[PDB]
Design a protein around this ligand. Sequence first.
Ligand SMILES: Nc1ncnc2c1ncn2[C@@H]1O[C@H](COP(=O)(O)OP(=O)(O)OP(=O)(O)O)[C@@H](O)[C@H]1O
Ligand SMILES: [Ca+2]
Length: 500
Amino acid sequence: MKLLEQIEKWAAETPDQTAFVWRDAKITYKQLKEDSDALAHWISSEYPDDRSPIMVYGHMQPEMIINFLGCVKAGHAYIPVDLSIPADRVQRIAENSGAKLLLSATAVTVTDLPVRIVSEDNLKDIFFTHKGNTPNPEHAVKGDENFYIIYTSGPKGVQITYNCLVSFTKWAVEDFNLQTGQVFLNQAPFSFDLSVMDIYPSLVTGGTLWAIDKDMIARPKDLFASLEQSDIQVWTSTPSFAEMCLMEASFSESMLPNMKTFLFCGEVLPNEVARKLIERFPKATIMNTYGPTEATVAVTGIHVTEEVLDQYKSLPVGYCKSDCRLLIMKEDGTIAPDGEKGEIVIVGPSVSVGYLGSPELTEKAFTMIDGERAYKTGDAGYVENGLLFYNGRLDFQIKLHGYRMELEEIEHHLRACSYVEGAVIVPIKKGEKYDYLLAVVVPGEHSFEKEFKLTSAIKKELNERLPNYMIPRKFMYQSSIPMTPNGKVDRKKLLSEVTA
Ligand SMILES: Nc1ncnc2c1ncn2[C@@H]1O[C@H](COP(=O)(O)OP(=O)(O)OP(=O)(O)O)[C@@H](O)[C@H]1O
Ligand SMILES: [Ca+2]
């Protein structure tokens, strides 16, 4: 029943099954409950009637998960902080959030923070000192109490409650057709809510989380060696991450014979990427999902079949979970007729209760409609018979020749051209106005003897897809597209190197 109870069920039924593994470090469900219980018991003894959020610092160590559960068992929401988050932002989070404690298995490198730091051996000592102890079942986070708080770079703390997470997880477990005892890949740092899509569905279904870290990602040979040993069955990642893995010829069914489900969220999933996955993994089901962190990971989802790939050049993002609903709003706070583009607004139990301590910010994006919470995504899109389509971020809309064009739509067409394997549009601005567009593309196999031949071929094909003023003036070619630590296109890095 209760989220924690459905997880703990596996501690009793399959105590020795691995719950989380990172390189050679692993922990069973039995161990997870034990240490988590010990930590919650300790938290409860150190902060008797306190329920302040607790920071959990690290990368992919099993302790990250132990600490998450320990925090909620004592009634505290946790704040995931990845090692890749700049110290400056960590310092802010420590102050924006009334957190009084930070937990980390590894050494904390961020300059003195206004919180009690429990790390390294000090964390080990609580697992030992409180070994065998159990917390008051009644202290566990429940109802509309915060379960976790994830900050959205920008930096505001999105508060996700117990009800919010239960609403997402139940839907994920049912509609993503997960089973039990499956191996789940974890690619996203815990500071990115995409990780929630694999963490909880895995735990409630007695699965095994197989973590891949930053260093491994940097060393392809290590990365691919890990996947080969993983036996991963449920793959949760950003589209960019899968695309990079796709650059390796051995990334196929042969490497992951028991692959059964691909779950994507966070960015546009190119029709081309899905096609390649079906070819490489004819036994796997591909799911595209959409949603902002402010709406608890994702609210829409759709099975990307051959038929879907056939009728939608640009893949839809899915049907809204049944306990929530969508609204497409145009120019004014008026609702748009189905088919018309407008700003995507989400309403239902998946919507966050708001940004932590940010009144003005919450008032601008969060609203109440018929008694329930609503959230303006800032995303442009439309619906057709319950199916939601994503056009792009309003903030990314470029204007040239008095014409407005979603940046993402231009990338869609560039990506669709022959000889293009990966591509990003970098707008070059001359002040407040757009000067011209620069296309960064990863060339596919070709026989062009000189660069201009390739650029000419792409511009000609692109001329059949876009108005001339939408076609990028300059092209740059490179073997790969950079990703941020979260696994998304590093647009800022690209703008930087093109500017210079
Ligand atoms: N399936 C999808 N297809 C296209 N875009 C998607 C999809 N899923 C999510 N997105 C995009 O990602 C956004 C949500 O990402 P997230 O909440 O993790 O932070 P962010 O907006 O990307 O960056 P920041 O933290 O600065 O706000 C959505 O608003 C949408 O623009
Ligand atoms: Ca956002």
